[PDB]
């Protein structure tokens, strides 16, 4: 069945497959989880105190997703992990091709 291209997915109780944790996903069909895993962000959900502490409008105990990392962990400058998350991605994809 040619899956429809556009779909009213994200709003309401109908989640998209191919993006569940469910390690069975990895077991049954490799080379697919080996892709979906390369996409999940996995950074943090750091809240935002300074926003509310000035009585801005926010849902109490809100959060955000900084897409990136730091570079000054206690003043030592490790090597910008996002570079690794990018490099292994490229490497894996070209190995597959």
């Amino acid at each position: 069945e040619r899956m429809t291209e556009n779909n009213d997915v994200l709003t309401g109780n109908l989640y998209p497959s191919l993006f569940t944790d469910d390690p069975t996903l990895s077991a049954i069909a490799p080379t697919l989880a080996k892709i979906a895993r390369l996409m999940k962000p996995t950074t943090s959900l750091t809240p935002d105190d300074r926003a509310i502490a000035a009585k801005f409008p926010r849902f109490k105990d809100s959060a955000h997703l900084n897409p990136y990392s730091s570079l000054n962990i206690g003043g030592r400058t490790q090597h910008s992990v996002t570079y690794t998350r990018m490099y292994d991605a490229i490497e894996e994809m070209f190995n597959l091709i």
């Binding site: 950074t43 943090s44 750091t46 990392s69 730091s70 962990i73 206690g74 003043g75 992990v81």
Partner: peptide, 14 residues
């Protein structure tokens, strides 16, 4: 578990 990205981790790694 999280590789030193939340504020208290700075209180740790340092």
């Amino acid at each position: 578990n999280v590789n030193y990205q939340d504020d208290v981790s700075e209180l740790i790694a340092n």
